[PDB]
């Protein structure tokens, strides 16, 4: 494994759970609060009770998604069954610091029979090629809102 592996990319199946960041104005103070909006979830702020009732009918951009460090992309795949060099994500690795890899990569040595020193026919790595072509962005995916942030993995502002 190279040195790109310390960086991009991690494949997730996501189903997000929902947190709101509601702003309470009682006309005397102005303050905002993270609170999970699923469940029956009591908090009291300024000694006024709020009970946040469940949130439903709520858009999900994520499904099958792959998060690169370049930009999130909505892409389908089938894990641990990519190999050779005709595809992007030729190596399939179980963990971030793995010791087992599913790849079918084929490179063909032959016996020396010349005054040089080995005959080789070499198909090289498909990943570097496919790197330009990319998928299509997760970021533009949303009917209303959603700016998808890479590092924590979220979507801010989905109305």
């Amino acid at each position: 494994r190279g040195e790109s592996c310390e960086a991009d990319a991690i494949a997730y199946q996501v189903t997000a759970s929902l947190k709101a960041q509601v702003m309470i104005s009682i006309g005397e103070l102005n303050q905002t609060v993270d609170v999970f909006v699923n469940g029956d979830s009591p908090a009291r702020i300024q000694q006024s009770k709020f009970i946040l009732g469940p949130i439903s009918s709520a858009w999900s951009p994520f499904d099958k998604v792959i998060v690169y460090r370049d930009e999130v992309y909505n892409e389908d795949y089938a894990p641990y069954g990519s190999g050779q060099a005709g595809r992007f994500g030729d190596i399939q690795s179980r963990t971030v610091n793995s010791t087992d890899v599913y790849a079918n990569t084929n490179l063909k040595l032959k016996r020396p029979a010349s005054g040089n020193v080995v005959p080789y026919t070499q198909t090289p790595s498909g990943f570097s090629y496919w790197k330009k072509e990319k998928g299509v962005p997760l970021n533009r995916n949303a009917p209303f809102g959603c700016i998808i942030k890479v590092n924590p993995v979220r979507a801010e502002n989905c109305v």
């Binding site: 190279g2 040195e3 790109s4 005054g115 040089n116 020193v117 090289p124 790197k131 330009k132």
Partner: protein
């Protein structure tokens, strides 16, 4: 190992087969490409080679010296020439032992050469195609407007 200087004393230069010996014939050459690793976004090529540059025969790390081993055994040359070339000069970011960092241009092949006292060259195919800074594939910035994150290979030894 545990000290980078000590590692390079241990790992003396060696010969390798190169088919290019001035493009005049195939011979054992003191220079050969072991592997080129690239995945930087600023176009930087990390070249591993048979020879040891920046390292003296005395067994010490000297910026003046280069220690080469081919068909004349292990000899010294002074750094006054090292060149890295796709087909035309590259800018050599940094050199320490078998490792060379250079910033290069597109090419189908990659060649490393000198014209000091070793006097020969090795060329092997390595694809270098655009991957350069930000969204454009046009290297050479005009000014500073927005600073963008990128990956490169550093000039510090580990």
């Amino acid at each position: 190992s545990v000290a980078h200087f000590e590692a390079y004393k241990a790992t003396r230069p060696y010969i390798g087969w190169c088919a290019d010996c001035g493009l005049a014939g195939s011979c054992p050459s003191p220079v050969s490409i072991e592997h080129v690793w690239s995945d930087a976004d600023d176009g930087v090529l990390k070249i591993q080679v048979s020879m040891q540059i920046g390292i003296a025969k005395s067994n010490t790390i000297n910026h003046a010296k280069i220690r080469y081993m081919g068909a004349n055994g292990v000899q010294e040359a002074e750094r006054s020439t090292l060149s890295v070339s796709t087909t035309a000069p590259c800018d050599i970011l940094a050199t320490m032992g078998h490792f060379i960092l250079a910033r290069c241009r597109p090419g189908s092949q990659v060649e490393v050469s000198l014209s000091t006292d070793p006097k020969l060259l090795c060329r092997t195919p390595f694809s270098h195609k655009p991957r350069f800074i930000g969204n454009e594939k046009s290297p050479a910035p005009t000014g500073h407007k927005t600073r963008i994150p990128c990956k490169t290979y550093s000039h510090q030894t580990d």
